[PDB]
Amino acid sequence: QQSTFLFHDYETFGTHPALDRPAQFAAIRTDSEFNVIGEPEVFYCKPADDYLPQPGAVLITGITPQEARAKGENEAAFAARIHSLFTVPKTCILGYNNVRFDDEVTRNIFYRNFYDPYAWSWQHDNSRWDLLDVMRACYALRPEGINWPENDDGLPSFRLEHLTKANGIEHSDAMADVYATIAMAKLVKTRQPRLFDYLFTHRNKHKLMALIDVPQMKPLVHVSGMFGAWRGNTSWVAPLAWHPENRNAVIMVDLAGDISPLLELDAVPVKLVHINKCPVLAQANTLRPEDADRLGINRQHCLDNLKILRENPQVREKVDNVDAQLYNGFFSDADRAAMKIVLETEPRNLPALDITFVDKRIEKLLFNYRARNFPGTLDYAEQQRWLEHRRQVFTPEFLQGYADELQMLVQQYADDKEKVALLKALWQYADEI
Ligand SMILES: Cc1cn([C@H]2C[C@H](O)[C@@H](COP(=O)(O)O)O2)c(=O)[nH]c1=O
Numbered sequence: 001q002q003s004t005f006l007f008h009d010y011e012t013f014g015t016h017p018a019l020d021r022p023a024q025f026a027a028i029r030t031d032s033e034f035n036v037i038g039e040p041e042v043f044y045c046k047p048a049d050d051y052l053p054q055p056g057a058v059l060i061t062g063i064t065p066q067e068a069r070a071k072g073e074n075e076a077a078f079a080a081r082i083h084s085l086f087t088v089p090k091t092c093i094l095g096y097n098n099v100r101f102d103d104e105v106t107r108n109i110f111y112r113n114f115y116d117p118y119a120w121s122w123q124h125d126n127s128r129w130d131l132l133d134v135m136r137a138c139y140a141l142r143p144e145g146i147n148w149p150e151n152d153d154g155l156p157s158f159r160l161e162h163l164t165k166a167n168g169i170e171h172s173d174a175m176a177d178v179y180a181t182i183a184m185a186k187l188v189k190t191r192q193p194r195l196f197d198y199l200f201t202h203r204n205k206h207k208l209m210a211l212i213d214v215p216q217m218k219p220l221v222h223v224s225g226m227f228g229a230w231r232g233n234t235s236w237v238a239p240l241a242w243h244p245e246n247r248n249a250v251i252m253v254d255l256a257g258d259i260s261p262l263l264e265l266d267a268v269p270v271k272l273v274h275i276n277k278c279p280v281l282a283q284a285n286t287l288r289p290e291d292a293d294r295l296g297i298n299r300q301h302c303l304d305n306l307k308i309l310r311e312n313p314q315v316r317e318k319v320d321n322v323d324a325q326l327y328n329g330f331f332s333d334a335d336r337a338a339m340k341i342v343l344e345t346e347p348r349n350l351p352a353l354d355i356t357f358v359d360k361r362i363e364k365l366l367f368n369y370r371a372r373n374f375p376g377t378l379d380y381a382e383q384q385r386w387l388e389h390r391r392q393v394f395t396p397e398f399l400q401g402y403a404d405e406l407q408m409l410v411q412q413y414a415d416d417k418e419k420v421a422l423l424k425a426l427w428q429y430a431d432e433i
Pocket residue numbers: 010011012013014015054056057058060061096097
């Protein structure tokens with residue numbers, strides 16, 4: 001009814017958004033002015049017994065598999081709680097690195113648990129945003145008034161913890177990262193008000209499409225992590241064409257690159273810009289001469305490449321584990337309707353549910369869903385199928401490797417008492433599972 005922001009963040013058991021499992025979700029809702037209006041939403045996800053967490057992830061988060069299992073609900077119920085927060089009308093769902101990471105975790109949790117992986121983002125006036133590329137855009141285009149820390153390599157850092165410390169934001173508990181993300185939003189809104197407004201409005205794919213002039217190859221500023229911190233994640237780009245299959249993807253040339261292989265053949269300075277993924281795009285003059293110089297971006301090289309590309313328009317023409325299979329395709333309307341019945345049927349009425357799916361992923365999705373979330377509902381043949389599944393995960397190579405990694409880390413981090421205790425926990429859990 002009113003426009004709100006839902007700030008959120010996952011802690012996970014590893015960095016693969018499909019093949020690792022979530023540990024904890026944290027979120028809070030604000031009004032359109034970033035005033036907190038909701039209660040903190042913090043909860044855990046019970047990991048199924050076909051999985052061991054990445055030791056490195058647990059050393060970072062401090063959340064053991066024992067803790068998520070004892071404090072969590074099954075992933076079906078975890079997914080339900082997240083889906084009910086995300087689908088409140090007129091919600092902008094945002095975080096810090098959510099476009100690349102947390103949103104991929106969400107898509108995969110929804111996929112595995114019979115929710116639509118995509119609808120949450122856009123239905124009922126919803127949107128997404130991400131403060132990471134907002135911070136990157138400020139550094140590159142409007143750095144005044146913010147402290148920009150360097151990492152140990154002498155490159156600008158966009159780690160949330162570095163930006164908060166550098167700008168006097170308290171950081172810190174479970175909610176610390178979510179509150180830090182709200183503080184970043186307020187920082188940019190205060191210190192770069194017009195840029196903040198511009199970036200917020202341009203989260204919308206139609207505002208982004210208005211910038212794109214393919215016939216003219218109209219140059220734009222693009223701020224992207226792919227460009228690299230050494231050039232402030234920034235270049236001038238030109239649109240060449242739209243993707244043959246992906247409706248949301250435009251094919252850009254990086255004008256700072258070497259266009260020789262693109263001109264001559266039948267590094268390639270070509271990238272996809274996904275207009276549904278909050279890319280930072282603006283008119284060319286948004287990168288001011290002083291900032292182009294600061295970032296080492298060569299205007300004349302970019303313009304020379306642009307001139308060549310415009311004179312050569314032939315360039316436009318030139319350019320298994322079911323858990324890993326989200327992007328194998330969109331489901332049919334019938335299959336989506338069938339999966340909605342799975343979702344909305346009681347888990348006790350699921351064994352008796354006779355329903356047809358055509359997409360070949362759904363049989364395996366359904367078996368995993370029932371065995372992971374509702375193991376008490378499995379019959380004997382299903383129990384034996386699950387035992388085989390666990391065996392095929394816990395291969396001789398995998399189990400040896402896991403033990404080896406723990407034994408290496410406990411020696412490596414011998415003097416870190418908190419890490420030693422976490423490694424003990426990881427061994428204990430692996431021994432059980
Ligand atoms: C920063 C970092 C995160 N992670 C995992 C655990 C975190 O819950 C998850 C998200 O962390 P982040 O949002 O700080 O990037 O990624 C690692 O496995 N290794 C790492 O070095």
